[PDB]
Amino acid sequence: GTGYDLSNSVFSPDGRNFQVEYAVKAVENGTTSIGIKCNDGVVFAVEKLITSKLLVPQKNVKIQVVDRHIGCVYSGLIPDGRHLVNRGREEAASFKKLYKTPIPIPAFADRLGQYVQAHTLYNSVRPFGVSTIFGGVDKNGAHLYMLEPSGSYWGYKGAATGKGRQSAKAELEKLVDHHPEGLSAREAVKQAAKIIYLAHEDNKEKDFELEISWCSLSETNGLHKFVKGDLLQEAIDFAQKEIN
Amino acid sequence: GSRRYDSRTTIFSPEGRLYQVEYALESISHAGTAIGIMASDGIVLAAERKVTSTLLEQDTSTEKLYKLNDKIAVAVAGLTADAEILINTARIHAQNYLKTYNEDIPVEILVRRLSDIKQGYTQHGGLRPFGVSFIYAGYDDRYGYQLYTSNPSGNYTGWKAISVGANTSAAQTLLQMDYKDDMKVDDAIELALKTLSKTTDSSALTYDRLEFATIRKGANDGEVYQKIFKPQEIKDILVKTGIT
Amino acid sequence: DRGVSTFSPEGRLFQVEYSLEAIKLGSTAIGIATKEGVVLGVEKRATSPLLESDSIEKIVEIDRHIGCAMSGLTADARSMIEHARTAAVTHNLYYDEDINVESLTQSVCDLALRFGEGASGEERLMSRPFGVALLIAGHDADDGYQLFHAEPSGTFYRYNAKAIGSGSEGAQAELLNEWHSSLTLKEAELLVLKILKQVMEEKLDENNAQLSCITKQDGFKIYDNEKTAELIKELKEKEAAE
Amino acid sequence: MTDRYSFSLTTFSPSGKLGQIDYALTAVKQGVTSLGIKATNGVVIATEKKSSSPLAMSETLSKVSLLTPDIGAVYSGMGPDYRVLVDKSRKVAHTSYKRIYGEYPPTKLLVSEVAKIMQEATQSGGVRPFGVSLLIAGHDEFNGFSLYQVDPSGSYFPWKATAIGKGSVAAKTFLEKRWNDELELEDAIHIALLTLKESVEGEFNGDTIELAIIGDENPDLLGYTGIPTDKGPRFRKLTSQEINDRLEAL
Amino acid sequence: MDIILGIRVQDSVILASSKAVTRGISVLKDSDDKTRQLSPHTLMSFAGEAGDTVQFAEYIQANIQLYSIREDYELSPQAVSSFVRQELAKSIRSRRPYQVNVLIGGYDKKKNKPELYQIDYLGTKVELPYGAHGYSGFYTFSLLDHHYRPDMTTEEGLDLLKLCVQELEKRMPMDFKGVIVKIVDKDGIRQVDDFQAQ
Amino acid sequence: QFNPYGDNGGTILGIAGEDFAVLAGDTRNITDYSINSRYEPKVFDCGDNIVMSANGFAADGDALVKRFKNSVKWYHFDHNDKKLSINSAARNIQHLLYGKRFFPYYVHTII
Amino acid sequence: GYDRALSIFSPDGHIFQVEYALEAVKRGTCAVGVKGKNCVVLGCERRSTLKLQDTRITPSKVSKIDSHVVLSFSGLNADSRILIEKARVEAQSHRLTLEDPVTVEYLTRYVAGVQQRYTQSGGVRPFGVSTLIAGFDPRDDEPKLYQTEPSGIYSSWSAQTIGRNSKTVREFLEKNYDRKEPPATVEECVKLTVRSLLEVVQTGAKNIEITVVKPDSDIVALSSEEINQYVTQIEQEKQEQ
Amino acid sequence: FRNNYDGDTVTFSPTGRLFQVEYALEAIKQGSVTVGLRSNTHAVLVALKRNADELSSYQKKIIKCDEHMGLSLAGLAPDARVLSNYLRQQCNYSSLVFNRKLAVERAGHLLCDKAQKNTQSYGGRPYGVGLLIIGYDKSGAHLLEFQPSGNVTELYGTAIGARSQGAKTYLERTLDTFIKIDGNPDELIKAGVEAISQSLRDESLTVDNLSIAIVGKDTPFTIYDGEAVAKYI
Amino acid sequence: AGYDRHITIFSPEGRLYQVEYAFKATNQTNINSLAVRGKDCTVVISQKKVPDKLLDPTTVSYIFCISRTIGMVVNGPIPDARNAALRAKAEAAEFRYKYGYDMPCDVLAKRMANLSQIYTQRAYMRPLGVILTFVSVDEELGPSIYKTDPAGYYVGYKATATGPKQQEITTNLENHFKKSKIDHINEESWEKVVEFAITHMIDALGTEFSKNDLEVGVATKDKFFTLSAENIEERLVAIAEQD
């Protein structure tokens, strides 16, 4: 029959979970965001559509840090994204409290994975309306991840989700082939600023505001930090220049 | 959510009837017939075993006559399993009463309790009612021999003779026709077998398809005695009353 | 089925909007606030001549300086009144003073949206909204005489005059013209009595209608039949006199 | 989260039927045949080890389980439902009896306990009835040998012999013809093997058939000595070989 | 403690309970009725801890009265005492046990015989021809053991009781301000308004 | 064992004039024979023209004052900024204190 | 765990489950109550769908809540039992804490509250019962008669009836009861009650039971004959014309 | 379509929408207009109070959460009470435990998170009210816009409610002007009123009809109603 | 009525459609795997497909290390597989803590099968769309393979296969054993057992594999471990020098 798509934990005859797929739709309808794993860290960037001149510039920050070494950016229903970081933050706090060492990126990823997957087990909850790109540096270098509303996640060389994920992935794959030896924090920051600018075409209608953050074992000491001032403007230029 | 699959077992019909109770009764109406007849010197409980076999161990079987107390017994019509749940809680109420007052529980008090439990599954909890109807035969020093009846609704009433289960309409007419206040236990025993014998949906009325019990006050003693007839005893009496 | 706390496509809560319909079917209740006190009057509306009309209590005292009238499923209003009386008394115990009319109302309205089958926000145990609206009237040192209209929505409004119940829209239009910022308590009394008479299916007498008021001096009082009957007559006269 | 299914999933239909229970029975009907025969000095329960693949190890999956040293069970219907029932059965025999009276429960009582667990899954909120019918065989000092059948409804009845599952009707008929109240245990095992043969399509050997008995005490299977009153378990699962030895004189 | 005596004669049970209520250094009242009627034919006297004493009695009374209306029947004295014993037996292993001792005197209309039950706060129950709680037994039992007879008339009972009370007034250190007496028989419960000088 | 209480010394005084009132208190806070501070305010302005001081065990005195000040704040919130009359504050404080009837605020408070 | 809202509002502003609760009351056997000048009389009708019952033990209709108050009802018998118990318990509790038996109005207000509560609580359906409660307030001789329904609403009546054909019997009472001169006698009050029941019972000597309640816990139910004698003297009143 | 996916907040539509939330957002549009704007020294809330009858009052739409924070509501009043009360507690907690005033941006996050919980679980309903939060903290003047979907945004100015778009275009135009009304509250307020009027149509803001609140550098959040706002009509 | 297809209640035929559809989900990954038992080791081969070039190949796996001795390969969506992995690890760690010895492979399989059976009976819990294959060298049973499914069913195997092309792998293996007449790969080294495993994986699937097309797990006395791309390459080279 039908109706297999009205309840969350229901398997359709083809073994799918429609409510989780519908969530993905809300994710694709959101701003484009990305991640780039360099040789000693990771960079995060995201598009911020400027609805009007009334939005105080540089204020409504989207990227979030977890603990002190993890960055998270997401596309889709923003409130769902914050909800997931709050959990992440509790998850990292708990882990550190018992084991003393800050939570390893892979371990953190599964914590978020298990939690999100949990919201696809009952019909009393709704799946998350976001795809998240998060990562950082730990005992064994850098790690970049992307988590889907289904709870699925993997390690990535580069990742993107949202409105212009195709343009993004396209550019990311190029970088992957042309740099088998690994990009650098400094370089990834500029590159990321470009991918965002290019990917902004699928939304060239509204003006936007770029946001970048990074976690580099050499540029930030393995601590997550936002790219501001000079370094930021330098990347905005590098983009505006290669956008023509 | 779950609301979708909630049958709502405890609501009123536009006519002011309880759906589940009515259907449970409809269920009981297909159960083996059970009869209860009160004489001046005792009570008689007779029931027809619904479905049997050559291989069914009748000596060890019990599906319609249960001992609740030393002075109270019930005849069951409906879901045996449901009945056993109530039987057990019934047996406990009796012992709690005994422990508290150091006197056997008056027959009505025990029936009202059990009926109250049934009434509950009728007003709250969202669970299906028990598909059971009881005929209580008991004795107490305040009303002597008593005969009661309770059904899925939780309603109970007293009788001189009554039946529950299949073809009660016919059975009740036959009893109303030949019952006399001055009867004697033996008269009652004979009437009970005659009634079943005429309402049976089976070929003949053999002993391997009957359950029989009597509550008398043994003249040579001064106390009450319950007797759950054994296969042979049922076979005997069946020959005497002329059913062979 | 559908949740008891679902939003209609227009941004309204079904159970609450339907609640308002049940209230329309209720007996008319009117309140008028003057600088000399507030008057509250209701339509007894007995369902038979054998029903002893004075056992109809649709005007109750909350505290000495607060009283209220109800319209709709009146049985639903018992716990609201219980809650209100407890609130007013409790406040006095804690602060050695009188609860402000507005606060008391706000407390009652706080129960309003406490319904659901498991609404995430606390523990709203109540399967449906109340099916009755209230006219809360009183006096206090800060804002003097006040008249409030508390709905099952959880919102309340202050009025100089207000009618709720079956004859509400008709009666409200009336109050619009009749009310002015310098009415006297008596002008308010006769006025409430008149509007009731217009919308009541029955011929208003001191048996199927009840008046009451609240004044700083004597507090909330429910007018006894004899006192009201004299006012009925006085109305009939002033009316026949033009 | 949290089970918000606190209402019955099994209810009465206008005809008075309890649908879910019927369907469970239907699921039982598709199950592999299993039977039980009560002799004068023992009881035998048997079923077919319908291997779902030749790569699977048929031993690892036993359909005949020991509940207490004198009680065993076999089924027809949904194996997983049966597996958990067996765990619950073994535990209830301890919690609600052995830990109270210091002795294992008599067959009827345990069966009664099992039936209760099944009755509940017929009325409790948020669950479906168990899709299995069990045949429990045991022996106790005051009741001797017995054989019971427990249905998804929670009902149970004592039998002299019976069968459940796929070819229950045919098998039940064949048993009514060979059963008498003077059968010895070995005679019952024989009749069991014959009855089971009709219900089996392919291979019929001690590796495709599972059969256990409740008979005399097995001191050799006790594990220790020194306590006179402890003579060993009456429950014993026949070995692949022991079955073949009998299939020859079949 | 207070005086609590009970004497079971041929056709009735008599309960005598001291009237004094002392709190510290002062005797607050001298007309206290340490009794509660549980049912038309069942009376209960009591002594013990300051507040628990009446709280308990009234709790029992309410329960027996509720049973009477629900069943439209009066529980036998035996049934009532078993109910009371169980209440006390629960209370003894609770957070704060009721420290109350009681005498239950009733007339069993069905057996047509008077019955006396003594039950202490531990839930210890026993049926007797006569009994007491506290030190009362110590002074009066030798007299009762002596003059008591199963066929005594209510009048003889009241006389034996009078003798007991005089012994109590002679040898006991405290002034319990006399006793209030009550009789339970086939016709209910009545109070001997004249014992201040019988 | 652990003792939840302590004595911080100090003394306070409250005098009601006909149309004015005063609440004074030394500013010395002590522990046994030691001085913890020569200047540690003990009398406070709690708004709505009310002055208060809870002398005795300093931790409790601070907790109370802090709790009462918050009470005034919520009073305004819940009663359209109605000023809290001295008599109303007094009744309020009675409840604050009695709330810990079985683990008292070891202070003598005056307003 | 089960807390589904079973009693909810429908578009027209109705609570169907409570509406249907009343439908169950209409199906119940008729009950009537009329207050005299110094007594209240409660009459009920007995069904006959099945007759061969034991009248000694079968639960009767008029129940005592306390020695001075009784309660009769129409609707689901099982449900009525739950109300009687709660009321009886509340009657004892009230005596225990206020040191005075309940007034008839208090006891009625209580029952009504329990009923109202079941109209807006999850996981429960309303009581399919409507009641008549009557008696005399402690140390008062003025008769009291009240009525409650599934919704939780209540009020007092001079005379009232609930159950099947209550419409009919109410009319009789409406054009047969004078507030000016209420049945000044227990006898002329019990008669007015039987007359109102005969309009619907249709010759029911064993199908009619009356209970008389007087001040100071004076309650008693008549036996077949006593009533049968009232029916008799009444059928003559008709023929004598 | 929609009909089968708007029965509650725990259901996504085939296109990734949450109707119950969108329906909630609809209650806001049906609500009376309210405006907010801020210079670098002050933040002003100008809200048009709406009346039921001409015998009724004009429902209060401005609430104070602390001495340095407050908000204006549009939509389900009861919900604004719940949210404003929750906000009052957080501001209160911050002061008591940390002796620190809660940052306006922090209050925004807290609101968003409370609102979000009511859009992912069965049984609850989204809040049906819009909020404009203004306040002056350690980083200056701030104006926030809260949406029931859980989205909170920091703006220089904005408006919500019926015809809100009128005033919203005005402000977006007057931007460079009002954002510099530093040190002069009365001017800022006049600008607020000259914006709220851009959404009129029915009547014209009166004395018992207008409601204004302000907070700033040296101005504890305060509310002006009636005659106190006469000098602005 | 038609809801008997949404929650796990019986259908008129006595079926549980949700359990059936859950089985359908196990093939979503389009991955095939198989396990075989050596003389003293257990091996599990599974296809490894990494479609995206932006993925970090090293984080793509469906094989898990449940304990020092138990290994688990999962057929089905990764999020459900990771849910089952975490639970199994927890169950195994606790068993050791409470009972004093390592949880046996078969027992863990039974525990996981029982958990699944519950989702089969309780309405609020959905089944997990996965099939779990546990392997190890049990201290009492020797090389072991136990597999559970969404039905809550489980059994031990001499060898087994799972995935879209399960039937082909199975018949291949069946044939080999009918021939060899023993229930295991008579090899002393696990390296040769891994080679047998991959060889038959190729025959049955008619496909060639590079070192990055496979994923291998090996269970030996007191230790289960997975092979590296290079450990596998060495294996691939060996099978090459024979064909």
Residues composing chain G: 241
Q: Which amino acid is at A183?
A: L
Chain A residue numbers touching D126 (CB-CB < 8 A): none
Residue D47: closest CA among D17, D69, D79:
D79
Nearest CA in chain D to G123: D7
Alpha helices in D150-239 (DSSP H): 168-178, 185-199
For chain A, list the contacting chains (3+ Cβ pairs, <8 Å). B, D, H, I
Element (H, E) at G33: strand G31-35
Describe the strand order of the beta sheet including B156-158 as a list of residue ranges: B65-67, B72-78, B132-140, B144-150, B156-158
Residue F50: closest CA among F1, F94, F14:
F14
Spatial neighbors of B28 by CB under 8 A, at least 6 apart, are B77, B78, B131, B132, B133, B151, B152, B164, B165, D16
Query: d(Cα B151, Cα I70) in Å, to the nearest integer?
Result: 56
Residues belonging to chain C with any Cβ–Cβ distance to chain H shorter than 8 Å? 2-3, 5-13, 109-110, 112-113, 116-121, 149, 153-155, 157-162, 172, 175-176, 179
Residue H42: closest CA among H198, H186, H229:
H186
Chain F within 8 Å of H96 (Cβ-Cβ)? yes
Chain D residue numbers touching I9 (CB-CB < 8 A): 9, 20, 128
Query: d(Cα D125, Cα I8) in Å, to the nearest integer?
Result: 13
End-to-end CA separation in angstroms for chain A: 53
Beta bridge partners of E188: E185
Strand H69-75 to strand H129-137: parallel, antiparallel, or no bridges (unpaired)? antiparallel
Q: Residue H213 is part of which domain span?
A: 1-233
Element (H, E) at G156: strand G154-156
Nearest CA in chain I to B4: I3
CB E38 within 8 A of CB E87: no
- HSE at residue G72, side-chain half, CA atoms within 13 A, is 31
SS (H, E, C) chain C: CCCCCCECCCCCEHHHHHHHHHHHCCCCEEEEEEECEEEEEEECCCCCCCECHHHCCCEEEEECCEEEEEEECHHHHHHHHHHHHHHHHHHHHHHCCCCCHHHHHHHHHHHHCCCECCCCCCCCCECCCCCEEEEEEEEECCCEEEEEEECCCCCEEEECEEEECCCHHHHHHHHHHHCCCCCCHHHHHHHHHHHHHHHCCCCCCCCCEEEEEEECCCEEEECCHHHHHHHHHHHHHHHHCC
Chain C within 8 Å of B1 (Cβ-Cβ)? yes
Query: d(Cα G28, Cα G45) in Å, to the nearest integer?
Result: 10
Beta bridge partners of C150: C134, C156
Spatial neighbors of I147 by CB under 8 A, at least 6 apart, are I109, I131, I132, I133, I134, I154, I155, I157, I160, I162
Nearest CA in chain I to B5: I3
Spatial neighbors of A31 by CB under 8 A, at least 6 apart, are A46, A47, A48, A49, A62, A75, A162, A163, A203
Which of E71, E86, E110 is facing B100, going by the closest CB pair? E86
Phi, psi angle pair for E160, to nearest 5°:
-70, -35
Classify residue G18 as exposed, middle or buried by CB count within 10 Å of its CB (0-12, 13-18, 19+): buried
Mind listing the domains of chain C with CATH numbers?
A: 1-242 (3.60.20.10)
Q: Do A3 and I126 touch (CB under 8 A)?
A: no
CATH at residue H54? 3.60.20.10
SS3 G39: coil
DSSP G124: B
Query: d(Cα B210, Cα B234) in Å, to the nearest integer?
Result: 7
Query: d(Cα C157, Cα C152) in Å, to the nearest integer?
Result: 12
Q: Do E73 and B109 touch (CB under 8 A)?
A: no
Residue G147: closest CA among C51, E70, C59:
C51
Chain H within 8 Å of B16 (Cβ-Cβ)? no
Chain B within 8 Å of C170 (Cβ-Cβ)? no
CB B233 within 8 A of CB B212: yes
Query: d(Cα C115, Cα G8) in Å, to the nearest integer?
Result: 11
- Give residues after which chain B gaps, C-N over 2.5 angstroms: none
DSSP calls for chain A: ---TTSSTTPPPTTS--HHHHHHHHHHHTS--EEEEE-SSEEEEEEEEE---TTBPTTTS---EEETTTEEEEEEE-HHHHHHHHHHHHHHHHHHHHHHSSPPPHHHHHHHHHHHHHHTTS-SSB---SEEEEEEEEETTEEEEEEE-TTS-EEEBSEEEESTTHHHHHHHHHHHHHT-TT---HHHHHHHHHHHHHHHGGGGTTS-EEEEEEEEETTTTTT--EE--HHHHHHHHHHHHHHT-
CB C115 within 8 A of CB G3: no
C-beta atoms surrounding B7 within 10 Å: 17
DSSP D70: T
Element (H, E) at H219: strand H219-225
Classify residue F32 as exposed, middle or buried by CB count within 10 Å of its CB (0-12, 13-18, 19+): exposed
Q: Output the six-digit token pair for I72.
A: 């688990």
Q: Output the six-digit token pair for I122.
A: 């309780």
Query: d(Cα B132, Cα B122) in Å, to the nearest integer?
Result: 13
Report the greatest alpha carbon distance in chain D: 63
Using CA atoms, how far residue D227 sits from D219, D222, D232, in Å, is: 11, 11, 10
CATH topology of domain I1-243: Glutamine Phosphoribosylpyrophosphate, subunit 1, domain 1 (3.60.20)
Beta bridge partners of H146: H131, H152
- The residues of A annotated as belonging to the active site are 31
SS3 of chain F: helix, strand, coil, percent, to 5: 30, 25, 45
Using CA atoms, how far residue C236 sits from C229, C241, I64, in Å, is: 11, 8, 93
Mind listing the domains of chain A with CATH numbers?
A: 1-244 (3.60.20.10)
Chain E residue numbers touching B102 (CB-CB < 8 A): 78-79, 82
Residue B19: closest CA among B134, B164, B126:
B126
Residue I128: closest CA among I27, I38, I207, I22:
I22
- Residue tagged 């009802």 (tokens): G73
Query: d(Cα A121, Cα A119) in Å, to the nearest integer?
Result: 6
Chain C within 8 Å of H67 (Cβ-Cβ)? no
For chain D, list the contacting chains (3+ Cβ pairs, <8 Å). A, B, G, I
- Give residues after which chain C gaps, C-N over 2.5 angstroms: none
Spatial neighbors of D94 by CB under 8 A, at least 6 apart, are none
Chain E residue numbers touching G96 (CB-CB < 8 A): 58-59, 62
Q: Do B127 and G2 touch (CB under 8 A)?
A: yes
Best mutation target, H22, H53, H129, to test chain C (most C CBs within 10 A):
H53
Query: d(Cα C28, Cα C59) in Å, to the nearest integer?
Result: 12
Q: Do B126 and D8 touch (CB under 8 A)?
A: yes
Chain G residue numbers touching C14 (CB-CB < 8 A): 9
CB B55 within 8 A of CB D159: yes
E-contacting residues of G 44-83, CB under 8 Å? 64-67
Chain H residue numbers touching F67 (CB-CB < 8 A): none
Residue E125: closest CA among E157, E154, E147, E92:
E92
Query: d(Cα G197, Cα D239) in Å, to the nearest integer?
Result: 81
Query: d(Cα D128, Cα D151) in Å, to the nearest integer?
Result: 14
CB C175 within 8 A of CB C32: yes
Nearest CA in chain B to D16: B27
Q: Which amino acid is at C195?
A: I
Architecture of E1-198 per CATH? 4-Layer Sandwich (3.60)
Query: d(Cα A220, Cα A229) in Å, to the nearest integer?
Result: 15
Q: Do I11 and D20 touch (CB under 8 A)?
A: no
Q: Do I3 and B2 touch (CB under 8 A)?
A: no
Chain I within 8 Å of D30 (Cβ-Cβ)? yes
Class of domain D1-250: alpha beta
Q: Do G95 and E66 touch (CB under 8 A)?
A: no
DSSP calls for H63-93: EE-SSSEEEEEEE-HHHHHHHHHHHHHHHHH
Phi, psi angle pair for B163, to nearest 5°:
-135, 155
A-contacting residues of I 137-176, CB under 8 Å? none
Query: d(Cα C234, Cα C228) in Å, to the nearest integer?
Result: 10
Nearest-CA distance from B188 to chain H in Å? Answer: 60
CB C113 within 8 A of CB C154: yes
Using CA atoms, how far residue E26 sits from A100, E20, E29, in Å, is: 69, 10, 9
SS3 of chain E: helix, strand, coil, percent, to 5: 35, 35, 35
CB A137 within 8 A of CB A68: no
Residues belonging to chain H with any Cβ–Cβ distance to chain A shorter than 8 Å? 4-5, 9-18, 105, 109, 112-113, 115-117, 119-123, 149-151, 153-158, 168, 171-172, 175
CB I224 within 8 A of CB I218: yes
Q: Which amino acid is at D44?
A: V
Mind listing the domains of chain G with CATH numbers?
A: 1-241 (3.60.20.10)
Chain B within 8 Å of A122 (Cβ-Cβ)? no
- HSE at residue G128, side-chain half, CA atoms within 13 A, is 30
Q: Which amino acid is at I31?
A: I
Beta bridge partners of B157: B149
SS3 of chain B: helix, strand, coil, percent, to 5: 35, 25, 40
Chain H within 8 Å of F79 (Cβ-Cβ)? no
Interface A-H, measured as beta-carbon pairs within 8 A, has a size of 98
SS3 F44: strand
Beta bridge partners of F53: F110
Strand spans (E) along chain E:
4-9, 12-18, 21-23, 26-29, 35-39, 42-48, 100-108, 113-119, 125-127, 130-132, 179-185, 188-191
Chain G residue numbers touching E62 (CB-CB < 8 A): 92-93, 95-96
Residue E188: closest CA among E116, E78, E107:
E107
Q: Do B1 and D4 touch (CB under 8 A)?
A: yes
* Domain coordinates in residue numbering, chain I: 1-243
Specify whether domain B1-244 bears CATH 3.60.20.10: yes
- Residue tagged 């089996």 (tokens): D200
CB G143 within 8 A of CB G134: yes
Alpha helices in chain I (DSSP H): 17-25, 78-99, 105-121, 166-180, 190-205, 229-240
The CA-CA-CA angle for residues C89, C94, C97, to 5°, reads: 65
Nearest-CA distance from F77 to chain H in Å? Answer: 8
Which of E71, E78, E110 is facing B102, going by the closest CB pair? E78
Q: Output the six-digit token pair for C202.
A: 């029955």
DSSP H2: G
Q: Which amino acid is at E40?
A: P
